[PDB]
Design a protein around this ligand. Sequence first.
Ligand code: ANP
Ligand code: ANP
Ligand code: A1ASE
Ligand code: A1ASE
Ligand code: MG
Ligand code: MG
Lengths: 388, 388
Amino acid sequence: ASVERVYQKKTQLEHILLRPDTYIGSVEPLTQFMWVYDEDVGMNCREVTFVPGLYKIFDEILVNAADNKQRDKNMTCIKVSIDPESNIISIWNNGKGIPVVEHKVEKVYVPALIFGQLLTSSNYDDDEKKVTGGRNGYGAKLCNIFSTKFTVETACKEYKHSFKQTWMNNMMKTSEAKIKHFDGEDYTCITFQPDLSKFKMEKLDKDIVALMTRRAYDLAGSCRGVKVMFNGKKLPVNGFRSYVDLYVKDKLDETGVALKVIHELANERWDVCLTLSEKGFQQISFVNSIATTKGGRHVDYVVDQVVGKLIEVVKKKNKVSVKPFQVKNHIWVFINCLIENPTFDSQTKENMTLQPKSFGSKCQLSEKFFKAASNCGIVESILNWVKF
Amino acid sequence: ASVERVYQKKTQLEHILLRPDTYIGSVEPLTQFMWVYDEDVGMNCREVTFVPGLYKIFDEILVNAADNKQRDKNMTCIKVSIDPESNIISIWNNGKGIPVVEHKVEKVYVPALIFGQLLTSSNYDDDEKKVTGGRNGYGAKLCNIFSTKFTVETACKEYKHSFKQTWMNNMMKTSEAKIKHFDGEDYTCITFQPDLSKFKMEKLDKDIVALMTRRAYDLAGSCRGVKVMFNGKKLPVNGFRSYVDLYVKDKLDETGVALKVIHELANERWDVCLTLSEKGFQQISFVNSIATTKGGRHVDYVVDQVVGKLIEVVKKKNKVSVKPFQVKNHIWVFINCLIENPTFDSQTKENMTLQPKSFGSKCQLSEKFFKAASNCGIVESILNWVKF
Ligand SMILES: Nc1ncnc2c1ncn2[C@@H]1O[C@H](COP(=O)(O)OP(=O)(O)NP(=O)(O)O)[C@@H](O)[C@H]1O
Ligand SMILES: Nc1ncnc2c1ncn2[C@@H]1O[C@H](COP(=O)(O)OP(=O)(O)NP(=O)(O)O)[C@@H](O)[C@H]1O
Ligand SMILES: CCCc1cc(=O)oc2c(C(=O)N3CCCc4ccccc43)c(OCCO)ccc12
Ligand SMILES: CCCc1cc(=O)oc2c(C(=O)N3CCCc4ccccc43)c(OCCO)ccc12
Ligand SMILES: [Mg+2]
Ligand SMILES: [Mg+2]
């Protein structure tokens, strides 16, 4: 091999296709025990086989829709459609559209800039302490790159125009946008056909559909004031507590007693539910409507408070050593939070790494909550073990 | 705010400084209970306060040195030097240098291309099934960008020249490389002054030095056939088993009995040690001399085998239900492995996501190992709990 074959330089776009894992996660199948929303049983936990990168290109568009609630607090609705037979996914939102106007620096229409060029964002000025999920200026381009067809439609009454442009072949082909007069109610609709060959798949199968469907339920639970429709039907989730009910309302502990679920809305930015776990520590958490599936400092911040109080309660009855990991072993926690300018260690945003002092808010759980937590079976489980 | 202030485009280099977290990890301090190598006590586990991004720019250069063992199996030595007073870190290695020659496509000297331009690598051709840690073509440029001064020195007898070039001010300033006749023993030496202002630090303090020192011990344990010196003294670690001894040789279980440590070199590519944990699941693992501090599929692959066998052993004595998470709760596992073309979800490479079928090798632990594992106190801990 010559010097020129050994030492190589890649463009940004080449690098994304060669090294997808740091952008969208694995492009190979994964089997994981997790929660999905199935057609036959609804919410359930089971082994699911899916390609993480395909989940993530969908998630990028879904979180972008949720983010529009921050640009326009009047937004009320996100509509998700998935058709496996045609391989078409669409995500529609109301509230303000994207300005249909030429960017005076980049000399392209704003929607074409921010959906068709890498490293483009409205989230790069951190002096604005935003609680959007978007931070990096990649997500929508990543979906475009991993799609055989990707269509952006947006309508903005302030600029009196609508915009429609389609990209094809992994963002490598496009044509002139259609610009039309518009004076109605604003919306944005992203419609894409994922490039299943990039994921070694033949079709959107039941497992990936059940995971994408569950993310729509997550959003109905996490994004305050936004209703969610899936395949033309409103999702019957109206807030985080009703979302948590999908997991715990019909569940018993191993002794046959219904799980006792405690809840506190500490403030507008923090919603916490807690119950007993009998299968080790479990967390379900969202930051700015992102599913933080590896947790992060927001989970540790809430859990450490509970662990500290419950160690106190146990000690007032343990006349040996109860270590924090033993208490955490019995916690199932659910968190929905809004964090200013969050940081994560990857574009996939599974682990939120911002320190609590920078969150922009606190979640000081009340003494009422801690009293209730001392009665949900965790303390009992610990004390029974202080006999062994 | 105008359209042009709201919607912004960044260059790759601007994006790295604005969004460092996905490239090097957090640039804010973190406190974590972990292992470091201190001047007073050696290897120990304690709360450590450090900035992850500073750890990682050092790690990128250290792993690049280890990677040279794959380009030249005759390499024998890596030398690490850290001087807090002068703020100078150097990492030196022998074995083949970098070709001191003009790249015929990029029209620059090879060392200047691969240390001074983003997305440059000898690891972009995956038809070569390499067990280097390098994959993405960023690491050395990230260290350069986060340094106030960054010097590359390399000497390559095949090309009969040595090369020395210095960058300054976060890779924004450089000058003509010094090229000289060379006919001696090849080496590469990277010397840098980290830009502590990027990490809100005044000096390389004892905690970061203790972590960087420990990574040198890790390398002495993980990189087969390479001796490591730190600040002019050889590290007395000669393989993975002697490295593991730094953690377990002087440790007792809670009942006062020395930890029983089991070991198997399954093949050249897999070294595994196992003992009892009394503080929940613990793993120490390396992939291609990277510390996989969030684990990954290589950890799960080994642990699942042990868990499966130990559940069998317990059952042959449990005439209730013992779940895998309960067995894993008592495992402390140490893994050193070589994986072909590994994938990770972040440039920081904390979590290795490649599926076992793609590893390029297997680690089928022997029946002798599983018998020994049934005697290291894990089974006993589980059975004692089958009474409660
Ligand atoms: N549904 C939408 N409605 C309005 N604006 C949108 C919508 N989707 C995307 N945008 C805009 O398009 C920009 C680019 O989106 P995207 O590529 O996902 O980057 P991002 O969301 O800012 N950051 P990230 O997702 O972390 O890579 C965003 O910053 C928004 O300004
Ligand atoms: N000590 C060294 N000796 C020889 N070659 C080196 C050394 N350090 C770096 N290189 C070369 O420089 C290239 C660039 O290094 P780097 O920027 O770290 O990228 P990488 O190691 O290939 N991938 P990554 O570390 O995952 O971003 C490597 O691919 C090697 O070819
Ligand atoms: C590579 C993508 C991994 C992933 C995506 C996802 O979408 O979900 C997950 C859940 C999960 O099912 N959920 C439910 C609601 C969203 C969520 C947030 C945080 C943690 C878990 C979850 C999960 O669960 C394990 C058992 O708990 C584990 C992993 C995931
Ligand atoms: C953001 C950087 C985090 C990190 C770096 C590091 O360097 O180490 C760590 C260790 C650790 O101390 N070690 C020892 C040897 C290297 C290693 C590999 C895998 C897991 C752990 C470790 C650790 O430990 C927790 C208690 O176990 C936890 C975290 C780290
Ligand atoms: Mg986005
Ligand atoms: Mg490297």
